[PDB]
Amino acid sequence: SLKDEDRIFTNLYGRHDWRLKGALRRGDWYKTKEILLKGPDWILGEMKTSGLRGRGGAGFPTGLKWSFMNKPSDGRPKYLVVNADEGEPGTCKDREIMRHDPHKLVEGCLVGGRAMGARAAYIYIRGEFYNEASNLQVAIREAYEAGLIGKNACGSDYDFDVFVVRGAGAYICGEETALIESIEGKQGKPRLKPPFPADVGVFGCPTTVANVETVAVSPTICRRGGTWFAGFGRERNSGTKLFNISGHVNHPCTVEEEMSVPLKELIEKHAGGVTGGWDNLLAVIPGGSSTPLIPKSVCETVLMDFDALVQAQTGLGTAAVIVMDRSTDIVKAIARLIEFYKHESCGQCTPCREGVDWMNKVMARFVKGDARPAEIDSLWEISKQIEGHTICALGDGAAWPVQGLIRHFRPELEDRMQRFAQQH
Amino acid sequence: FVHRDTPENNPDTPFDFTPENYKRIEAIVKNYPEGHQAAAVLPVLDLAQRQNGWLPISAMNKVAEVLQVPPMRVYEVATFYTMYNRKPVGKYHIQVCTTTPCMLRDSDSILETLQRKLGIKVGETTPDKLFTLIEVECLGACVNAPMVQINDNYYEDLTPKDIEEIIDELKAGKVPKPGPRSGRFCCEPAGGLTSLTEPPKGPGFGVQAG
Amino acid sequence: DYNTYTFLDLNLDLSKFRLPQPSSGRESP
Amino acid sequence: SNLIEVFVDGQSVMVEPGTTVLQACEKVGMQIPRFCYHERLSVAGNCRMCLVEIEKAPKVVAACAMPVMKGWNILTNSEKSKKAREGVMEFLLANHPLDCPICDQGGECDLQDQSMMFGSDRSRFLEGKRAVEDKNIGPLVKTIMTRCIQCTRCIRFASEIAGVDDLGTTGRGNDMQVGTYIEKMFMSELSGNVIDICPVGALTSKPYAFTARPWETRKTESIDVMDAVGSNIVVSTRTGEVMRILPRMHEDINEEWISDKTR
Amino acid sequence: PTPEQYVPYSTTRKKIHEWVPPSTPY
Amino acid sequence: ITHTGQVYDEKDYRRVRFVDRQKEVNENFAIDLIAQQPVNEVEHRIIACDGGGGALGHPKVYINLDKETKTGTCGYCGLQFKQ
Amino acid sequence: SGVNNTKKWKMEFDTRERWENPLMGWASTADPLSNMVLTFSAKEDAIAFAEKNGWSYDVEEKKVPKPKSKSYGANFSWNK
Amino acid sequence: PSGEERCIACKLCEAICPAQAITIEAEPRADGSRRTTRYDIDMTKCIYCGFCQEACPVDAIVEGPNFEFSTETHEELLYNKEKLLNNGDKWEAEIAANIQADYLYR
Amino acid sequence: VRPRSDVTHKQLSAFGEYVAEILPKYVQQVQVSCLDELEICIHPDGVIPTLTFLRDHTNAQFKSLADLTAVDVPTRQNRFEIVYNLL
């Protein structure tokens, strides 16, 4: 599977100094100058060969993504935006990187910029995490002191000035076009994609956005080479990823295990075991709230890699595993996720604004069982109207859990329908 | 989402960044790109919130003034984000995560415990003005599910008893242990861990040649 | 282990290590 | 040169670079249904009632927004782009308060017609509706804003055509209400245009509140005499007394806008 | 279930109002 | 006299009509009748107003009695609702 | 914002007296050709109708909206 | 029942009248509500189609049961709002019973 | 959806060509509408000839005149559109 010798993030769960001294001891900032000296090209070949997929909600080939803003500058400073907003529910994945191994992030940002000529990078850590940022800020201060970051980084002529931006409790801020607008200081509402972020981004200057995990692994991969990373996985879903297990399991934890490992093994080797026995598994949410839940019979068969999941009709996403024993009212579980999205969508687009509120009202009635059985496929149809028509992906995300509940748990919802009709 | 003139909250309410605060304000301005100040409205609005939790209409007017932006521009930012409070809040503003990870593991019970001790319903503030309870959504840190963020404290992995205990420390005395209250080391598996046992590999270990 | 003004003050300190930022070149967008 | 050749259903209307999907349809001769897009107002994409289906493409595109590319075929009357309108109109109408016999933009509604032409025959919103709180924007515009389809045309005009920059969106979710956060009247010339530019009858004219209904109004095209710009205007007369004066477009003089005085 | 003729008239008002000449002589 | 106070006047050339025949005017003018209607107190932020009787009423509208400052008035019944 | 009523040319006769009716206050008109608006597809054909019927005509050229360049990316420009 | 006249002057009863019989002009009553200053059904113009009964959203204008309203003078047949409202008050009890019997059908 | 019987659409189309070939001289346009109706259009001079062929032809006997009408398209140079419907 994965050996400690072969691990990208090697300071998880603390136990070690998050400061530069400890980070250096661990082996961070190694020949960083040489890396930059290798030249932006060399870094993207590394990432490309690495097959590092985006560790964010949706995995886009890192190499290509970074490559786009590798086109010649048109007189506007290129920029780096690192989304440190851990918005996805069930995902404490990133919080760990910054809190425990921040300096890795710092170097990653530097390596990141060299890859795309960003004078500076801005890290949008969610405002909720006030404590988390301070630590990161401290580490950054130290790196400037070391000369690691700032003018002539590591002596290399490259000049990089990293920043930390306060989030303000919005899941949508996380979106790529909306992170920018929050950075820009306007309301956090995703812009459209046709002018892509590379071409126009933060402050209308070439900009690129990466999940903090994506920025963090790039230096290790650069130093340790693309092949190493490439070997651990299969085809595209190739790489080491932090997988989180939260809910109805013996030991919730963020493992860090290698990718494409059997769902069972992941929750078996680590995570203790499904609380109450593997057979007490009403369903598994593989990528977090946005991805559709998969019921037990499908799960062990399938494993956690993006290709395998899309075959399964679900998304690897943030790889946040939320598990539901046979002791849970799923109709109400998914219902609160729709409540999670009505309290959160920006309302900029018509299909998400009214559609997500419409499903919330129907879902609440479904939990009570007040609604008739015919309404259940009605919500199917409302779901796909929202799925393909939304300006951003959150409407994409709201539709999928609804679709999953109807797809695998249609008989249970009908019974809740039946239960209320009987008592009158 | 509408503001109405009231003696307690009006442009009349006095607000001005402390000499120390104003200093902070500029620090924010240069962090952002030159010629760009508008981008700092949020960070600034946050320091107005740091100054005073209420952040009345008067405070937003000043923010727009200091940041020379259309006032509405600040009003829109304050309304969109839940982090900003446009109403006075209690001393603690206990925020309970009640979304799927936390729902699982009974966050509601924790809510019940909190409500009981505070003798107040969710979304209501104690007359003591030290406590204000709100059912907030995913606050991150799910591996530790039972959870209640208190002014960033982000207590974690809490059982109902711990919650009341925490309130006790806050109710009369110093703050409780910032962070989780369980045997698990951070987000290591609950009883110990089964990973990263090997000592950290040496700098340059298995470094790809050149 | 941090007071409300820990971050901003830290940021003020970070100024000793930052180049003069660039500008779009206009009085106000 | 600079003539992208794109097929609107096969018409190969060669357009200049940067032509938006909607603009190509206009040139070929069609008119993609649309709520948030005004020719002299910035593209916002809020409604997404204009979703069309470029050929051989997985998702439908936003007409007002996608710059048309080379080789595209903007299938407009496809089986998909109609489910992309039959399902949006489902949403705009769902939270809408049905007071069409109060809404004096009765026959002047770009939302009933588009419903009657690009919408569905019946409703499935068995759930409850929302309501916002009517406020005062001044003595000329009556904002019965429970009507608002959050199309952000006003916030644009009030910032782009007129430099008021006051009207703004407040909040998120299904209670985003586009009204002044504090109650400050929208006092500016060019103010009454908001009426004409809000396709919904949320905010309409207070003097011409309920004096008429548009089918009756006989419309005679004449000239503004209040000011020397000589703005073109249409005087709407019913049974021989003028009921309203609203702008008519003159590219050079008043391009779809008239002053608060001359209306 | 266990003189009065309706005279028709317009119920609207004056509409156009003319300018009263000033009763002050000049 | 009438609702909108139609007053063919002492000098009008039309008041001639009523001579020897009465005018049609209304007692229990409506203008004052709803004003005579008590304010429907409610618990919920928003309330409906079928007009009373569903199909035999007005197209149902939901009124926002959200501000005690103002009693919502359904544009159809003129009924004020007291939050 | 619909443009389906700005397509065909129409020729309309000049407006005439609309005095109030004394008994009921209804509008009353003595001009027969008032409500008549004939619709003609092209300017040339409408001019022909006026000439053979002997009515005086004063044609107004169609004025169509000028092409306007729009692009979502352009307003995102902080520069301008 | 409260006493507020049902008509809210949407004026589509005027729109669908085949004979042009109904003439409606309106203005906001001081209450702020919307009411018709003048509502004139010319019964001699009217061909009693019953579409107005159909069209009204609040169902303010109804086809009342009485058929015996023959009048000595032509002017009496022209009806303003006060005659129709008075006609409505006189026959409201039967009109309510009639609408009660036939509304399920409509 | 109306119960269209393609059987008709074809047979009437076929007659439309038949007539078009039989009287090339006066028939300008012939079309069977989607409403399953044929509307031969003839030059005004073909009024006598086209009718007579339809009234007295074994393969097309159109004995009675249902109606003679004239729509008036003012735009059209030839204002009237005399229409003769035959059974």
Ligand SMILES: Cc1cc2nc3c(=O)[nH]c(=O)nc-3n(C[C@H](O)[C@H](O)[C@H](O)COP(=O)(O)O)c2cc1C
């Ligand atoms: C509603 C919404 C919320 C999102 N939240 C996050 C987030 O909290 N963190 C994140 O990295 N990406 C988030 N994303 C995805 C980002 O927009 C972007 O696609 C991703 O961060 C790209 O990172 P990668 O290229 O490293 O995969 C979100 C997307 C949507 C639609």
Ligand code: SF4
């Ligand atoms: S979907 Fe439409 S509404 Fe929901 S967030 Fe993305 S943009 Fe805002």
Ligand code: SF4
């Ligand atoms: S806007 Fe006024 S008219 Fe158009 S639909 Fe909504 S209510 Fe009926």
Ligand code: SF4
């Ligand atoms: S008010 Fe009219 S214009 Fe302004 S947003 Fe609501 S709908 Fe669009």
Ligand code: SF4
């Ligand atoms: S009668 Fe019914 S329809 Fe005619 S106006 Fe009054 S309300 Fe509208």
Ligand code: SF4
């Ligand atoms: S019945 Fe009602 S609709 Fe039919 S004519 Fe008389 S008035 Fe017009």
Ligand code: FES
């Ligand atoms: S849902 Fe409460 S923190 Fe993950």
Ligand code: FES
């Ligand atoms: S018009 Fe295309 S998005 Fe509103």
Ligand SMILES: [Zn+2]
């Ligand atoms: Zn009512």
